[PDB]
Ligand binder design. Structure first.
Ligand SMILES: *[C@@H]1O[C@H](CO[C@@H]2O[C@@H](C)[C@@H](O)[C@@H](O)[C@@H]2O)[C@@H](O[C@@H]2O[C@H](CO)[C@@H](O[C@@H]3O[C@H](CO[C@H]4O[C@H](CO)[C@@H](O)[C@H](O)[C@@H]4O)[C@@H](O)[C@H](O)[C@@H]3O)[C@H](O)[C@H]2NC(C)=O)[C@H](O)[C@H]1NC(C)=O
Ligand SMILES: [Cl-]
Ligand SMILES: [U]
Ligand SMILES: [U]
Ligand SMILES: [U]
Ligand SMILES: [U]
Ligand SMILES: [U]
Ligand SMILES: [U]
Lengths: 141, 202
């Protein structure tokens, strides 16, 4: 199902770690014109499908952002990735009861923006792990 | 050198931009402020904070969209026509804001102490333009109340409702009441509110 216990986000240490990882990367992100994760990412996505969408973003972030950058931003990277990874795993059995179009398109625009920005795009994504964390929290309860 | 510590000071969503003067600073230095929304391209000049001599600027209205994140930058122009620009880190009011003490009213009775929490209004406007309260913004917000009788025995209540009443109290006695706002999602905790009360005679 598409839901995550509230206890996954109530933990101060791993959360501050995520936010500090996000902050360190944002200081390095110089592009203030482009924001990856926001309300537009939900553009035409039913409230009951937001968690599913965030599962996709999270998965992509793990595979095309974090892993490729697992060397930078230490020592936060080292503790956060495994945390986000578990959440991703938890959602590995989350599916929607409809067509995957309006959603797929939405996630693709994000993947596209990140690729077009290249390495700095990956940096930007990390700097937005705080936004990802919260969107992920509000969408999956 | 000229500009240092450019940052937002946020309390109950009142967002004030502040900064200091660095080493090569001087008293006749003027400052000009601009702000922008993260994810947008243009910087907007803050009408009331251009060429000012003070070291703070109220950006509450400009940064009041709870869905956006912002940036602000100060441009200092020193006595010699020398200038310098510095901007804040990405700003998220939901994350950085501090919470003032709860609006609470303690009513004492013969054998119980009553505490009424009132909605705390913020500058955040809804579509219809009215003011949203902290409760409107933070859905998981809850209160933590405590009634102290002495160094070794304290009563405690908690919840999302506004009215609380501690029972089992001895008349004409003194108690120290404490109430604080808690919002777990953002790990925020308001300054405590304290009301020292005494139960009625009998
Ligand atoms: C700090 O505060 C505590 C508790 O405060 C009181 O209780 C709370 C709930 C509020 O109502 C406050 O307004 C009250 O002041 C104080 O402890 C109390 O100490 C008094 C002694 O001065 C105790 O009263 C005595 O209790 C005796 C035993 O009664 C109980 O136990 C028996 C056997 O287990 C049982 O049968 C009975 O039913 C009771 O459960 C009793 O014989 C005697 O006559 C007298 O009533 C009282 O019990 C204590 N309260 C509690 C719940 O702990 C501290 O004294 C105070 N500190 C100071 C020094 O100010
Ligand atoms: Cl409130
Ligand atoms: U992927
Ligand atoms: U899918
Ligand atoms: U200098
Ligand atoms: U203001
Ligand atoms: U907005
Ligand atoms: U009484």
């Amino acid at each position: 199902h598409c839901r995550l216990d509230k206890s996954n986000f109530q933990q101060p240490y791993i959360t501050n770690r995520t936010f500090m990882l996000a902050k360190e990367a944002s200081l390095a992100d110089q592009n203030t014109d482009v924001r990856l994760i926001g309300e537009k990412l939900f553009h035409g996505v039913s409230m009951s499908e937001r968690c599913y969408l965030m599962k996709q973003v999270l998965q992509f972030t793990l595979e095309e952002v974090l892993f490729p950058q697992s060397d930078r931003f230490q020592p936060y990277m080292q503790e956060v990735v495994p945390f986000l990874a578990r959440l991703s795993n938890r959602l590995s059995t989350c599916h929607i009861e409809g067509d995957d179009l309006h959603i797929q398109r939405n996630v693709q625009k994000l993947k596209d923006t990140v690729k077009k920005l290249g390495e700095s795009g990956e940096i930007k994504a990390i700097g937005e792990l705080d936004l990802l964390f919260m969107s992920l929290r509000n969408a999956c309860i | 050198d000229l500009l240092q510590h450019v940052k937002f000071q946020s309390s109950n969503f009142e967002n004030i931009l502040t900064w200091d003067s660095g080493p090569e600073g001087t008293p006749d230095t003027v400052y000009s402020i601009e702000y922008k929304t993260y994810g947008e391209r243009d910087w907007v000049a803050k009408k009331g904070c251009q060429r000012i001599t003070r070291k703070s600027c109220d950006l509450t209205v400009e940064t009041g969209d709870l869905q956006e994140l912002y940036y602000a930058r100060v441009t200092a122009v020193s006595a010699g026509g020398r200038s310098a620009t510095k901007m804040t880190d990405r700003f998220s009011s939901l994350q950085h804001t501090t919470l003032k003490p709860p609006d609470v009213t303690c009513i004492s009775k013969v054998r119980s102490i009553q505490m009424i929490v009132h909605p705390t209004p913020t500058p955040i406007r809804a579509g219809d333009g009215h003011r949203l309260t902290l409760e409107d913004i933070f859905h998981d917000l809850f209160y933590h109340l405590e009634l102290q009788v002495n160094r070794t025995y304290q009563m405690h209540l908690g919840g999302k409702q506004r009215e609380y009443e501690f029972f089992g109290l001895t008349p004409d006695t003194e108690f120290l009441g404490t109430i604080m706002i808690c919002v777990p999602t953002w790990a925020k905790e308001s300054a405590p509110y304290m009301c020292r009360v005494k139960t009625l005679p009998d």
